[PDB]
Structure formats: structure tokens, C-alpha cells
Design an enzyme around this catalytic site. Structure first.
Site, PDB file in Angstrom:
ATOM      1  N   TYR B 508       0.940  -1.207   0.031  1.00 48.47           N
ATOM      2  CA  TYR B 508       0.110   0.164  -0.070  1.00 48.47           C
ATOM      3  C   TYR B 508       0.895   1.249   0.066  1.00 48.47           C
ATOM      4  CZ  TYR B 508      -3.863   3.072   0.165  1.00 48.47           C
ATOM      5  OH  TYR B 508      -4.994   3.740  -0.303  1.00 48.47           O
ATOM      6  N   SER B 591      -4.881   0.428  -6.014  1.00 42.10           N
ATOM      7  CA  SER B 591      -4.925   1.698  -5.548  1.00 42.10           C
ATOM      8  C   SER B 591      -3.554   2.274  -5.517  1.00 42.10           C
ATOM      9  CB  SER B 591      -5.911   2.018  -4.474  1.00 42.10           C
ATOM     10  OG  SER B 591      -6.552   3.258  -4.366  1.00 42.10           O
ATOM     11  N   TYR B 592      -3.199   3.168  -4.159  1.00 43.47           N
ATOM     12  CA  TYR B 592      -1.917   3.716  -4.221  1.00 43.47           C
ATOM     13  C   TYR B 592      -0.881   2.737  -4.599  1.00 43.47           C
ATOM     14  CZ  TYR B 592       1.385   7.304  -2.647  1.00 43.47           C
ATOM     15  OH  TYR B 592       2.475   8.293  -2.322  1.00 43.47           O
ATOM     16  N   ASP B 669     -13.799   2.954 -13.506  1.00 45.41           N
ATOM     17  CA  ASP B 669     -13.182   3.196 -12.251  1.00 45.41           C
ATOM     18  C   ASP B 669     -13.520   4.830 -12.557  1.00 45.41           C
ATOM     19  OD1 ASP B 669     -11.528   3.964 -10.191  1.00 45.41           O
ATOM     20  OD2 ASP B 669     -10.758   1.808 -10.739  1.00 45.41           O
ATOM     21  N   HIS B 701     -13.365   0.929  -8.870  1.00 41.29           N
ATOM     22  CA  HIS B 701     -12.356   0.734  -8.349  1.00 41.29           C
ATOM     23  C   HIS B 701     -12.117  -0.424  -7.357  1.00 41.29           C
ATOM     24  CE1 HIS B 701      -8.368   2.594  -7.592  1.00 41.29           C
ATOM     25  NE2 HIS B 701      -8.594   2.727  -6.259  1.00 41.29           N
TER      26      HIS B 701
END
Ligand SMILES: *[C@@H]1O[C@H](CO)[C@@H](O[C@H]2O[C@H](CO)[C@@H](O)[C@H](O[C@H]3O[C@H](CO)[C@@H](O)[C@H](O[C@H]4O[C@H](CO)[C@@H](O)[C@H](O)[C@@H]4O)[C@@H]3O)[C@@H]2O)[C@H](O)[C@H]1NC(C)=O
Ligand SMILES: COc1cc2c3c(ccc2cc1C#N)O[C@H](c1cc(F)c(F)cc1F)[C@@H](N)C3
Ligand SMILES: COc1cc2c3c(ccc2cc1C#N)O[C@H](c1cc(F)c(F)cc1F)[C@@H](N)C3
Ligand SMILES: *[C@@H]1O[C@H](CO)[C@@H](O)[C@H](O)[C@H]1NC(C)=O
Ligand SMILES: *[C@@H]1O[C@H](CO)[C@@H](O)[C@H](O)[C@H]1NC(C)=O
EC number: 3.4.14.5
Lengths: 727, 727
Positions: B508, B591-592, B669, B701
Site C-alpha cells: 500500500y 489503488s496507491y 473506475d 475501483h
């Protein structure tokens, strides 16, 4: 010796040579070689330099393409080329005098012009800017406007809309000069009520928000565009008052519903032919119109009107065939399928509705190429009874039994696929041989029909290919439900029938295709055999072209049935021949072939292990009206909706469990929308089948940008090598 | 023996049990058994049975979630829930009466209702419908219409636009009752000139032309939505005259530029607190605003302005911290970062404005959970110097030095990770232990601090899990630059320290993320360790949180720098432990950590064999303004343009040449737009780098759809298996 490798094909190591020429008179032609547009002479070689490497050297622009006025004074110069769809594109234009070694400066042609053309005699211009038509009698004089109606994505004067460019005229242009340029004919399309395909275009990474593209595109069953038609008289234009454009409206057989304009063809200075075609594409009407020098309006005498309809399917091959008038414009020759199913020439007469066939047989006529006062010249696949090959024939117009091959036996082992290109009065013709040997371009006189010299024999290439281990081509047929069906194999070298080699099936199989032919190509397939020892095969079973209607119309209204079953049943045949590994049978295709690849892997057939499908159709209601409805009818209960729905890839998702599948698509495909594959991946995900997929950001249906082109063909290379176990 | 499998994980075999409840009094609470709502007395046992596992078969519609009126008299019922962004939805709402067992008909709450909530005392109601606020005093009676500005995509009254929803309030709701139910405050959002992301939605096979979704969304630099605030009172409503709102305008420290509303908090019946934050987020201001029974307006006294600002980086962990007020309204406690950068609790007294710190040290207050006249109750990570862990304390207001840990030793082995919920006035509270051992739910009493009963100890699961070769977890640290940095590993059953294992690196790594904890998890890693024998390890490096600002603000203005560095660094440490196989090391993340994983692969260190990036950000100017600017400032050359441009995944293309990459992205997304991956792919194809890719049609997402959740975890598991060479 070295092997043909994937890089040879991608860096284009071994280029075929060709001989592009323009004629410009009954005696003469042009040919850039080293950027030097020469002017060649036909009888001898009394040939001369027309334009320098240089000259324009100091233009500070790349000269995208060129065009001379047919009287010889001026040259048109095209640059700032920016592509649109298949044939459409927008460009900048500048004109150059050759009696004054000088370039024009005033009233020049507005940048971002959609299309430019010269009259056939002299040097008048027609051009389309911002949907409207303009005319320029002389290059430096102000331009005469001709329409006002033109509006982006609504009205199109003298250019085709999206769908007419693709599947009718194969051209952006929709103008037609008379023979001497007296008049100018044109076409007008209306997309007002036609709906929009919408999609994303990402661009340079600099671009912050992604753009939507909106294109009026009528899918199967939807509202289509409309078409109007006019002829204006160019020889009387007014500085003062507007331009009056005479409409030649369609006939009542057509006016009762959705129709299409499919052909425009001048016969004489004041006599034009029209063909139209109903949305239900089994019924076509021609119309011959004379000028009335009393009322300058246009008559199309019902007596001279001509009907063409189909009982077994759809009219023409892709559209009604095109008519060739004799100089008096009082009869015409034309291709029309006879009453055994075979396409041959008919000699009509402007006023009588029976035609007289001048060709008979079990073979078809591919094109009429030229017409004198004692001979017609045409192209057929007659020689040795093979539909894959093409040859040139002349026919004695005072005796239809007196008929002659001109190409067949010049050199029959090297040469079996001919095009022909004629001097302005069929005093000469160039011949082009595409295979099976190395292309051989040559030059001939129509009187002696005796060949003067060789133009290009592809010898540089010849010499390298003695250095390459090369594949081999069986072309042959096999019999079914009582009938011959052609295939071709590409065989690795030193090919040994003992051994069980793997087999990739290159498919297309859409209506009127041919993948089994006498042509010479270095392609992907060549690399797989040369370097991976994979047999590449193609097969033209039912649906396929140039073998009569009995074979072309089988799939009529029933797409995704017989062409699929036939691709499957040919793979069976190939396994049983027993130099094939009946566990290493794969299949691939693009566009229509990608669909048929997708239906065959969906079929639960047992036969194929790996599939690859590139921008495939998945559901015909997603393709456009004009192609789709020609073969399918309309997707209503009242007509053919049901086959519409049984025929979708989506309904077969569960059987891909049995196979390894790869699915590729451009994100910006105007033609077959990404939509189509979106819907496939979604159905396979929702019944839990694993599979692979590559999107290609911002490519279209061709995926032909150089780098995408190296990626895809590599990626697909890896997939085949992988499934076949090749190390 | 048997192991934990991809199928157990996807089909969700071994379920936890949670014990959720709703405190609805100082000493009673609801909760289902099966289908059945009990209330439970806390002192002892009274269960009462608030509602039945029948009652509602009567109903017809497919009921969803329930709400109760404070005075206990009414119950609000949700159905046609129709999912939108991450917190935003629409639904329908019937009101049942509990005293009658009737059902309000005359005057109900319309379909497509956006938000709805009881006041806190009695039976008052506020809701939003086409972006307008409506109040009902009595549920049997005619709604009062509060705003008339509402308008789809532009004006939001009582509800958040996409940015405030995702990035500030983590809520669709923007209304605020006063504690005794009188006044009600709301936020109005504008979005006129916010530009619009556009993307395709394909829906079912049956949809013939896709759908373009259009959503107002500011990317980095783009134009933000402005913001206004109002208070209206609910006892003085008129049915003849439109209904008055008092504006309360932001301070002039805020008004000069772009700024946001980051929190709303009522202190008394007639005092409200408003937190404002600047666009450049290193500077917040608090207001405190009393009524004025004479003017009817609201007076924000400027002795009462509390300015919190920052210089290492930004204010808050992700926003300014919330105030908890003293019953009288004149003082409050709020968590603030102190002089050595650790977050601890500060007492403020509304008039003087230097806060006094109630707590200190080298650890951090997670949050403030309750206030009594006697004590403050807080969660923290102090216990044992461990930031992974979490524990509840209380501190004596009369004497700081005196602080008890309520949870530490309760059950020391199994329980280090606590969360809490107190009763209406803190007489009781439930404890939630979520790891490292199995989850364990308990009830406690304030006066005694007494351990009343165990509500749920999950022994059902405990049996089950003694049949499986479960992995084991290590939490621990390493030292870089004389600083502790925490890793956790998931280790296979019968881990053997003399062996070599492959190693995936879950990532993450975003600002104030935390992957190294003592929480207990059954997930894809569980499957990867137990079944396919991989060590799966995450790392809490620079940026990561709860360890204070020297570590957390290290990435200030500088994303995709150190946190990426540290992810490589961590993998290097791990391979030198000598149970890791240097040749088989992966990395992945959503994600990140999609971005972080891409940039690792693109870094050219060679440490990673392959990688997978799910829905990554590739370039920060494609992300929303609020989160982005919070860590990067602005993409102008007078601020941080140069890093914005240096920190792209696309400029690292040519290094993806040393790696097998797999890129994945939902076509719909709404957060990280498929835009972002499209640009990655294109980059790679340009420099010629083979990769593999997958779109997911109309997923967003989360890729949470049952079937797709399954598809991707299966696709990914194959990909890893290829890479580590495992069947
Ligand atoms: C949400 O935010 C919107 C702006 O982001 C706001 O709309 C105002 O701003 C728009 C710009 O989008 C303006 O067009 C408009 O105000 C102006 O309109 C005219 C320009 O087209 C301009 O002529 C007006 O000025 C005239 O009138 C005023 C008095 O009314 C005088 O001051 C001037 O001298 C001149 O005579 C005017 O300035 C919009 O009002 C939305 O209203 C906002 N919605 C909310 C807060 O609910
Ligand atoms: C306008 O005339 C033509 C159009 C042709 C076309 C041909 C293939 C041969 C054609 C041949 C002619 C001819 N002559 O195939 C095209 C075509 C067919 C597909 F199924 C498809 F998915 C994409 C595609 F471009 C179709 N759109 C138009
Ligand atoms: C507004 O509140 C929050 C928002 C949070 C957010 C967090 C991570 C933790 C958060 C924690 C809180 C809190 N509290 O990350 C989210 C986030 C960050 C990304 F880089 C990204 F690509 C997608 C994404 F949803 C971001 N959209 C919002
Ligand atoms: C084109 O068709 C549209 C129908 O929407 C009509 O409104 C318009 O007048 C037409 N334009 C012409 C034929 O000039
Ligand atoms: C409330 O204001 C609106 C719009 O500003 C207006 O249409 C309406 O007349 C007012 N309502 C009443 C009941 O007067």
C-alpha cells in the site's frame, strides 16, 4: 542458409518491388524513381524529365502527394495530411504553374480541405471545404460557392458520411465531372436523425481530461442517413446571383422507403446513369437521364429504366455491378449473374430490358477493364478451372465465339494472378502479376497484343531469397455435400509428411471472401512456417466468393452458421491427412475472421486448443446497417431478429472453458467498437472462464501504427509458441 | 492434511462472527439473533424483543436497513437501494409506527431519495430529494421545503459532491442537527465550472449504443467546487412563507482564496464550531459561533478562533482533528501534533488560546472515544512501544499523571488490537479485539470497570481452524538510519528456516498508511502461504503513520520517492535473511500501491522478477485535486510542477523491459480512471515492452462484483504461479 524471422517481417528486411505508374494520354505515362517524376514513352523510350528530385526542395514542407491538370499546365500539391477514417482525410493545398515555373498566391485553396479534383479535360477545379462545394474555372480566380447546406455531422455536400465511405463508395469523394467538365454531379447526405457512437481518446499524456468522440453511426435497425442528388452546369456561373443545382430525384420504387444511392456513371456529355438500392438489399433500379437543352432540366425516360433483383439473396457482390457504355452511349456491357448462379457480361441497350449474355460458363468475370469498337477486355478466373487465379481476356464484338487469353501462357508457372492497367485509349496496357512467382510487371501494345519490354522482374529480392530457407504452398481442393472447396497451406521447408507438424488456421470467411489463391506474399504466416515449423492454412467454404451464387448465397440471412461449421469441418479434414498433430490445432482471425474465430472456439467442437480474436464482431446489432442488413435483413420480429440473437458470441461463453482464448481490441476502433469485445469479456467473467486480453490504447480497427504493429504480432507470437510448446 | 485454498477464500468458507449492536439508551441496545431484533439490557439480561423475524412478510418489497426514532416511537425503512459512489446511494422509504403497528401513507418520503435522518430527540425528520432539503415535524404530515437551489450535477444542498464525499466527509451526508433537535445546519456545494470526467458504460448485451457517464471531478490544478454554510431552525417553520436560512460565512483568512469545509461540530444547544481549511492545506482555522436570541443571526466571536497550522507538512492525518466539548460548551479536547511531532490530547478553553497537553511521549493517540465529568477515554498505540497495536485508556481530569489501561492485560496473548463503543452516557461499553488471535467481543461497566459477560468468542471458527495448516505471522522491525521500521510476514505452515521460499510483497505505502499490524485476517495471502507456499510480507516505511511526523511528513511534496525506495530496501533486507530465494520475488498492490508497485518495477533495480498493478495511478495530474494537492501542492511551475512530471510511471517505460508486468483496470473506475492505465500501456508499446493486461468491463475501483472478485484473484494467482514456476 538463414530462416525467415519475425524481425524480417517487422523491420521489413526483404521488400517486394512494384511498378506504380500513371498514364496521361493514349501514348504515355509517369514514374517517380529517386523522387524524379519522369515521363515515359510507350512505343519506344523517347522519354524525358518532367519534374526534379528537388524543385520543391525549398518548400519547407513535406509534399504528401501530387496531381497534374489533364491539359498539362498546372500541378496540385497536397500536404499537411491528417487522416480521418479509412479513405477520408483532411489536407492543405497549393497550386503550381509549369509554363511560368511559379506558384499561385491568390484565392488559394482554404486549409483543411476535405477533397480536391480536376475536370477530365482542361484545368477547372472542384473542391469541398467545410461540407460545401466550390468551383474554380481558373486556379487564380475567386472561387464559386455551390452549396450552403453543409454542416459538420449533419449535412454533407460532395463528400460521403461515415457509412457511405466505408460500405458503398469506398471513397470520401462524392462528386462526378462530365466527360469534358461541362457539368458537375454530386451527392448530399443527411445524418440529423442518425445516432452517435461515443468513445474515448486519451492522446499525449500531457492531456488532462480524456476526449469523447462522437460519430454519426447507424447500427443494424437504426435510423440511417438520407441522400439527394443534383447536377450543376459549370459553364455558366454568376458573380452576382447564387448557383442553381438541378435535382435528379430517385424513382418511386425507391422513394417508398429507406433506399441508398449506390452508383453514378456518365455515358456521354449529357447522359448519366444512376443506380439505387432499397434498404432491403434484394432490389435495385438503374436510370438513364438525358439533358434537355430546352429547359436545362434532366429526363430519365421510364423506358430506359433498368431493374435488377435477387431471388437467392442480395444484389451484386457488395453492391450492384457497374455499367460500361459504348461511345454512342446507346448500349452497355455490365456484369450480371446469369441463371445458373454464375457472374458474366450482359450487353444491354439503353431502351430494351432483355440483355444478351456474351459469356457462358462455370467460372466468373471479375471485372470489365476496357472497351474498344472491336473488343471488350475483361478479367476472369477461367484458366485451368481455378477460382483463385486471375487472367486477362479480349472478346471479339462481331463474334462472341472469337475469344482470347492474353496473359495465361506468357509464363504460366511463375504467373497466375493478373491485374491490368490501360493507356487512355487502350493502345497500351501494363500487366501486373502478383504471383505465384515473384511479381512481374510488363508492358504491351493492343494492336499486335505484343509485349514490348519488362518493367520490373523483382531480381534484387530473387537473389536474397536464394539465401533463405522458405515455405511452400499447396493450393488444392477437397469435395463435400458433392462440391469443390479451395484451401491453401503454407508448409515449412524441408517439409516431411512423416512428421506431425502443428497447424494454425488463418480465417476470414466473410461473404465473398477468398483466402485460397495464387498470390505471392511474405507475411506473418511465412515466419511461423519458416521459423516455427507451423503449417498455416486458409479455407474458402460456403459464403465464399467467385464461384457462383450457389456458393456465395448459402449464408444469406444466416451469418455465423455455415461459414463457422465449414471452418470446423476443414480442420477435421486436415487432421485426417495425418501430417498434422491433431492436438496442436489453433485458429486466428481479424474483423470478421475474429468473430468466426470466436464462434468456432465457442462451438464446443473439440477440435481447437488455442484461439486468438482481433477486433471481432460479437453481436450483429452492434455492426453498422449497410453491411449488416445486406446479409441479415432487419432485426425485428417481423423479419430476422431471432437469428440475430442465436448468432451472438455472448451466448457461447460457457464452452470457452474447453479452450485457451486471447482477445485483443483497439480502444478507438470507429468501425467495430470496443463495445463489442467489452461485451464478450464480461460474459466470460460472469460464467467464470479464465482468458487473456490486451487492449490497445487509441488504435483503430487496423492497429497499424508501426509500434502497435510490432507489439501485437509479437504478443500473438508468444501465445502460439506458448500453447504449441515451442521453445 | 488440507490447507487454506483459493476456493475457501473466494467462496468464503471459514466465516468470522462479529457482534454488532446499536446502543439506544444509556443501558440498552439492539441486535439480531437470526432475522430477529432483540434489545438487551446491560445491567443484567432483559431482552424485550424490539421487532420480529416475521412482522414484515406483509411488506411486498425487499427490505434493506432499519432506523429508529430517538423517543423510540418510529422506524424508518429502506428499499430500492441503488448503489452510486462510495457512500452515496438512492432509496425508498416507508414509515412504520411502533405504538400502533400502522404504516404512514398520507404524505410519505418519495422514491429516489438521497439522504434521510431523524433529529436526535423525538420524531423529527430531514431528507434530500433532487438536491433540495425537506423537513417533516410529524411523520403523518406535509413536508416543509427548505431549499430551491438544488440542481443535478451543479448544486448540492445537504449532500456531497464527488470530491467532498470521497476526500472530506467520507459521507453523502452534509446536514447537522443541534443536540436538542431545534436548529439544523447544512452545506451547499457548487459545481458550475468544475470540469467533467467522461467514460463508457456498456450495461447489458441488450443496450445497443453504450452510455457515456459524465461526472464533475477536479484533477490536480483543476477548478474546485466552492462551498457555503447555513443554519436554519425547525420549531419556527411557516407553511405560508418560504423558509429562512442564516448564512455563516468563512473567516477572511479563508475567504481570500480557495478553501474547504473540513468539519462541523455542535457544542451547546446554541453554540456551533466550524473548521475551515485552505486549498493549500498547511493551515486550518476553527470558529466558534453562538446564537443571539435578539438578532436571529449567528455570532462567531473572534476571541474564539483557534488556528492550527503546520510546517513539516500538512494539518491532520488526512484532515483537521475533531473537537469534543465539555458539557457546558466552554472547553474542549482535541488531538494535536506536539513539538516533537507526536499526536496527543490538548485541553482548550474557548477564550484563552494556548492549549495544554494532557498526554505526551513517543507514541500516538489514535482517537478520543468519550467524555465524563470525571475522565476522558482514548484509544492509543502506547502499549509496549508498538504502533501495530491498539488499546483503550482513561485519564483522570483532576490528575493527569494518573492513567489506567483498560485493555492491556485483559487477555494479553490473543488481544492487542482494540476498538470500542460506549453507551449513551458511558455507563457501559463493548470491546472489540480484532487480532492477533481470533476476534473476541465483550461488555464492560464504567463504575467498576467490570467485565460483565463475553458476547462472542468465535469458538465455532476455532474448532474448524484446527483442521487446517494455517500460516503464522511475524511482526517485528528493522533499523534504518537509527530508526525502527515495522514489517510483518505471513509464513507457511511448518516454515523451515534453512529453506528458500519465493516472496510476494503486498503493497500500500500511501501517506499514513499502516500495513504492519496485529490484526487477524483470512485473505488471499492466507491462501498463498498455506496452499502454494509463498511468504507474503508488507512493510511500513517512510510516509507510513501513527509513528509521528518525522516519519510521516518525509514524503511531503514528494510522493513516489522514499516510500518506493523503502519498498525496494525492504525486499533487499528480506532476501538477505536467507530463507528467501533472490530469483523469485514479486510485488503487487491495488489503488496507491498500484502506483508504488509500478514505480518499483519501473525503477530498474532488478530485485523484482515480476509484478502486478491493479487500478494504479500512473500520473498525479490525473488524480483528484483534494487528496493530491494535500501531499504535492500545485502543478504550477511556481510550486511543484517539476516533481509532478518527474514522478510519472510512464517515463519509466524502458525499464519495464526487465520484468513481467500485469496491468489491470475496471473500465468504469470513477476514482482512478482507466485513463491512468491506458497511458501506461501506450508508453510501454512505444518503447516495445511485452506485458499482459486485462480490462474489467463496467467494474469500478473495487472490482467487487461477486464474479469479478473471483475472476481477478484467479487471474492473479495464475500469473504469480507462472512467475515463481509452481503448479
Ligand atoms: C454557483 O456558482 C456560480 C458561479 O460559479 C454562480 O453563478 C454566478 O456566476 C455566474 C458564472 O458562472 C455568473 O454568470 C452569474 O453572475 C453574473 O451574471 C452575468 C454574467 O453572465 C453578469 O452580467 C451579472 O452581473 C450583472 O448583475 C449583477 C447583479 O445581479 C451586478 O453586480 C453587475 O453589475 C451586472 O449588472 C452577474 O455578475 C451567476 O450569478 C451560482 O449562482 C452559484 N450558485 C449558488 C451559490 O447557489
Ligand atoms: C464498398 O465496397 C466494399 C466494402 C468491403 C468491406 C469489407 C470487405 C470487403 C469489401 C469489399 C468492397 C468492395 N468492393 O469488410 C469490411 C468489414 C467487415 C467486417 F465484418 C468487419 F468487422 C469490419 C470490416 F471493415 C466491411 N465494413 C466493408
Ligand atoms: C476523508 O477520509 C479519508 C480518506 C482516505 C482516502 C485514502 C486512504 C485513507 C483515507 C482515510 C480517511 C480518513 N479518515 O485513500 C484513498 C485513495 C488514495 C489513492 F491514492 C487512490 F488511488 C485511491 C483512493 F481511494 C483516497 N481516495 C481517500
Ligand atoms: C436534413 O434532414 C433534417 C431532418 O432532421 C431536416 O430537418 C433538414 O431540413 C434536412 N436538410 C436539408 C435536406 O436541407
Ligand atoms: C419559494 O421560492 C421559490 C423560488 O425562489 C418560488 O418559486 C416560490 O414562490 C416560493 N414559494 C412560495 C410558496 O412562495
Amino acid at each position: 542458409r538463414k530462416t525467415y524471422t519475425l524481425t524480417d517481417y517487422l523491420k521489413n528486411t526483404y521488400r517486394l518491388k512494384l511498378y506504380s505508374l500513371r498514364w496521361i494520354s493514349d501514348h504515355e505515362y509517369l514514374y517517380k524513381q529517386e523522387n524524379n517524376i519522369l515521363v515515359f514513352n510507350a512505343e519506344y523510350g523517347n522519354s524525358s524529365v518532367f519534374l526534379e528530385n528537388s524543385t520543391f526542395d525549398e518548400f519547407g514542407h513535406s509534399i504528401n502527394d501530387y496531381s497534374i491538370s489533364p491539359d498539362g499546365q498546372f500541378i496540385l500539391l497536397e500536404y499537411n495530411y491528417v487522416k480521418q477514417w479509412r479513405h477520408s482525410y483532411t489536407a492543405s493545398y497549393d497550386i503550381y504553374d509549369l509554363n511560368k515555373r511559379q506558384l499561385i498566391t491568390e484565392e488559394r485553396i482554404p486549409n483543411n480541405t476535405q477533397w480536391v479534383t480536376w475536370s477530365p479535360v482542361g484545368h477547372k477545379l472542384a473542391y469541398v471545404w467545410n461540407n460545401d462545394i466550390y468551383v474554380k474555372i481558373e486556379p487564380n480566380l475567386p472561387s464559386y460557392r455551390i452549396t450552403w447546406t453543409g454542416k459538420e455531422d449533419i449535412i454533407y455536400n460532395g463528400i460521403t458520411d461515415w457509412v457511405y465511405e466505408e460500405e458503398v463508395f469506398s471513397a470520401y469523394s462524392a462528386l462526378w465531372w462530365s466527360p469534358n467538365g461541362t457539368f458537375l454531379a454530386y451527392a448530399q447526405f443527411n445524418d440529423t436523425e442518425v445516432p452517435l457512437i461515443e468513445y474515448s481518446f486519451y492522446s499525449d499524456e500531457s492531456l488532462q481530461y480524456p476526449k469523447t468522440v462522437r460519430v454519426p453511426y447507424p447500427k443494424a435497425g437504426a435510423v440511417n442517413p438520407t441522400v439527394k442528388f443534383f447536377v450543376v452546369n459549370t459553364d455558366s456561373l454568376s458573380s452576382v446571383t447564387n448557383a442553381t443545382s438541378i435535382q435528379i430525384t430517385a424513382p418511386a420504387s425507391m422513394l417508398i422507403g429507406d433506399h441508398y444511392l449506390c452508383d453514378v456513371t456518365w455515358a456521354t456529355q449529357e447522359r448519366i446513369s444512376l443506380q439505387w438500392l432499397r434498404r432491403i438489399q434484394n432490389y435495385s433500379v438503374m436510370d438513364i437521364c438525358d439533358y434537355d437543352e430546352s429547359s436545362g432540366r434532366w429526363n430519365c425516360l421510364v423506358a430506359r429504366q433498368h431493374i435488377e433483383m435477387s431471388t437467392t439473396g442480395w444484389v451484386g457482390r457488395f453492391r450492384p455491378s457497374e455499367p460500361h457504355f459504348t461511345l454512342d452511349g446507346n448500349s452497355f456491357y455490365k456484369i450480371i449473374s446469369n441463371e445458373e448462379g454464375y457472374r458474366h457480361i450482359c450487353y444491354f441497350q439503353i431502351d430494351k430490358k432483355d440483355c444478351t449474355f456474351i459469356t457462358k460458363g462455370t467460372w466468373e468475370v471479375i471485372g470489365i477493364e476496357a472497351l474498344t469498337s472491336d473488343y471488350l477486355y475483361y478479367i476472369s478466373n477461367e484458366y485451368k478451372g481455378m477460382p483463385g487465379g486471375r487472367n486477362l481476356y479480349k472478346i471479339q464484338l462481331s463474334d462472341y465465339t472469337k475469344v482470347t487469353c492474353l496473359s495465361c501462357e506468357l509464363n504460366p508457372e511463375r504467373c497466375q494472378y493478373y491485374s491490368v492497367s490501360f493507356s487512355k485509349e487502350a493502345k497500351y496496357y501494363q500487366l501486373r502479376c502478383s504471383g505465384p512467382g515473384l511479381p512481374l510487371y510488363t508492358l504491351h501494345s493492343s494492336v499486335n497484343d505484343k509485349g514490348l519490354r519488362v518493367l520490373e522482374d523483382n531480381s534484387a529480392l530473387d537473389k536474397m531469397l536464394q539465401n533463405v530457407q522458405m515455405p511452400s504452398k499447396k493450393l488444392d481442393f477437397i469435395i463435400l455435400n458433392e462440391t469443390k472447396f479451395w484451401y491453401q497451406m503454407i508448409l515449412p521447408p524441408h517439409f516431411d509428411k512423416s512428421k506431425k507438424y502443428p497447424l494454425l488456421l488463418d480465417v476470414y470467411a466473410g461473404p465473398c471472401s477468398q483466402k485460397a489463391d495464387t498470390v505471392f506474399r511474405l507475411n506473418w504466416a511465412t515466419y511461423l512456417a519458416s521459423t516455427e515449423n507451423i503449417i498455416v492454412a486458409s479455407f474458402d467454404g460456403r459464403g465464399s466468393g467467385y464461384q457462383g451464387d450457389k456458393i456465395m448465397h448459402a449464408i444469406n440471412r444466416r451469418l455465423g452458421t455455415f461459414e463457422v461449421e465449414d471452418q470446423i469441418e476443414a480442420a477435421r479434414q486436415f487432421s485426417k491427412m495425418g501430417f498434422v498433430d491433431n492436438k496442436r490445432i489453433a485458429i486466428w482471425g481479424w474483423s470478421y475472421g475474429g468473430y468466426v474465430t470466436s464462434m468456432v472456439l465457442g462451438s464446443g467442437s473439440g477440435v481447437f486448443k488455442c484461439g486468438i480474436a482481433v477486433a471481432p464482431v460479437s453481436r450483429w446489432e452492434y455492426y453498422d446497417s449497410v453491411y449488416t442488413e445486406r446479409y441479415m435483413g432487419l432485426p425485428t420480429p417481423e423479419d430476422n431478429l431471432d437469428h440475430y440473437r442465436n448468432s451472438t458470441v455472448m451466448s457461447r461463453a460457457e464452452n470457452f472453458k474447453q479452450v485457451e482464448y486471447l482477445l485483443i481490441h483497439g480502444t478507438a476502433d470507429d468501425n467495430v467498437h470496443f463495445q463489442q469485445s467489452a461485451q464478450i469479456s464480461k460474459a466470460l467473467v460472469d460464467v467464470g472462464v479464465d482468458f487473456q486480453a490486451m487492449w490497445y490504447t487509441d488504435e483503430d480497427h487496423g492497429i497499424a501504427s508501426s509500434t502497435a504493429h510490432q507489439h501485437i504480432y509479437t504478443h500473438m507470437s508468444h501465445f502460439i509458441k506458448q500453447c504449441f510448446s515451442l521453445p
